[PDB]
Design a binder for this molecule. Structure first.
Ligand code: CL
Ligand code: MG
Ligand code: MG
Ligand code: NA
Length: 379
């Protein structure tokens, strides 16, 4: 039995397995190689993954996401106090530990963050088992390099709840470096910068690698900058466009806004490979359909400050690591938003034309590395 590698991500998760001499990133039942980190509770069912995200506009108070922002934290942590203000589900305090409180089968129930993440992990484990054809019992699970002992412990506990023996909790930028084989280097220090622009967070890490030993030299970023912020710029643009065209403001209709948001995420993805995207929503508001388009250049304008902002954490990490640009051996892209051509241009330009390691789909690199490491640990 192979062990699996799981990237338990803030917004999406991904699972890989090393077998027959290579990594398989595993597609779920819908054919998607990443799965939303969402769990929903209804009057009759518990939904996880695509099925949960697919009904988030219908059921916002009982559809849980962003559990990774709570996991391992005390209730009175200022992060928890701040983040809770912008979620539609309830967070409660049980002995200075946060729980998420929902309605399920008609009864109010509350769950620790590690229970919610265990449900996502169970989904990822079941995606792997369906592909492998046998039960999986061993996994490597990744976490951000900044996670503390409690956050690591809670993630490990999520895995155990899901039925996994957690071989190791490893850092996300480490896993991304392992995916590209950068752990194989011999004696002599190499400096690797991981530029990880995810759905909800932006992490820059500088690692040294010397004869397969990793050290974290610097971390920088913004825990509230990610692809969803670019989607939000598109949403606001289209709310204004709908207003100008129909003389109706859709912005306080939470369902309309959530549905436009999901369509802007699709459009954003399309714009990484095409120079325009068509956006066509049935019955967006008061039975009015919204068919329009946006160009890549217009999208870039709408996001220009946010894209530029990704370079200051690179500068800060370099300062903290006491390195010049020229001393970085490898640049590794992680996170779906690193597919955006303007973001690649900004980073490569800042590095004076250096190559970017970008051949592994950047949504999958962390899982890919976790899978390699899980197989090493097995063996
Ligand atoms: Cl699935
Ligand atoms: Mg990630
Ligand atoms: Mg993220
Ligand atoms: Na993060």
């Amino acid at each position: 039995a192979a062990a699996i590698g799981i990237d338990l991500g803030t917004t999406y998760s991904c699972v890989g397995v090393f077998q027959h001499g290579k990594v398989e990133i595993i597609a779920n039942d819908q054919g998607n190689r990443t799965t939303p980190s969402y769990v929903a509770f209804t009057d009759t069912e518990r939904l996880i993954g695509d099925a949960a995200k697919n009904q988030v506009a219908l059921n916002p108070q009982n559809t849980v996401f962003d559990a990774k922002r709570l996991i391992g934290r005390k209730f009175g942590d200022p992060v928890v106090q701040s983040d809770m203000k912008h979620w539609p589900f309830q967070v409660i305090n049980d002995g200075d530990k946060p729980k998420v409180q929902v309605s399920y089968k008609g009864e109010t129930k509350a769950f620790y963050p590690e229970e919610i993440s265990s449900m996502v992990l169970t989904k990822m484990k079941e995606i792997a088992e369906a592909y492998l054809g046998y039960p999986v019992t061993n996994a490597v699970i990744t976490v951000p390099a900044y996670f503390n002992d409690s956050q690591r412990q809670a993630t490990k506990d999520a895995g155990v709840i899901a039925g996994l023996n957690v071989l190791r909790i490893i850092n996300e930028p480490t896993a991304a470096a392992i995916a590209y084989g950068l752990d194989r280097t011999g004696k002599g220090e190499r400096n690797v910068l991981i530029f990880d622009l995810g759905g909800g967070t932006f992490d820059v890490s500088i690692l040294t690698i010397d004869d397969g030993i990793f050290e974290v030299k610097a971390t920088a970023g913004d825990t509230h900058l990610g692809g969803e912020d670019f989607d939000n710029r598109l949403v606001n643009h289209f709310v204004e466009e709908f207003k100008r065209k129909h003389k109706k403001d859709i912005s306080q209709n939470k369902r309309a806004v959530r549905r436009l948001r999901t369509a802007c995420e699709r459009a954003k993805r399309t714009l990484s490979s095409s120079t325009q995207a068509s956006l066509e929503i049935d019955s967006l508001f008061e039975g009015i359909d919204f068919y329009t388009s946006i160009t890549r250049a217009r999208f870039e304008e709408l996001c220009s400050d946010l894209f530029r902002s990704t370079l200051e954490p690179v500068e800060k990490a370099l300062r903290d690591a006491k390195l010049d640009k020229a001393q970085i051996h490898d640049l590794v892209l992680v996170g779906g938003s690193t597919r955006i051509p303007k973001v690649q241009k900004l980073l490569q330009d800042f590095f004076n034309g250096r190559d970017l390691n970008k051949s592994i789909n950047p949504d999958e690199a962390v899982a890919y590395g976790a899978a390699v490491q899980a197989a090493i640990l097995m063996g």
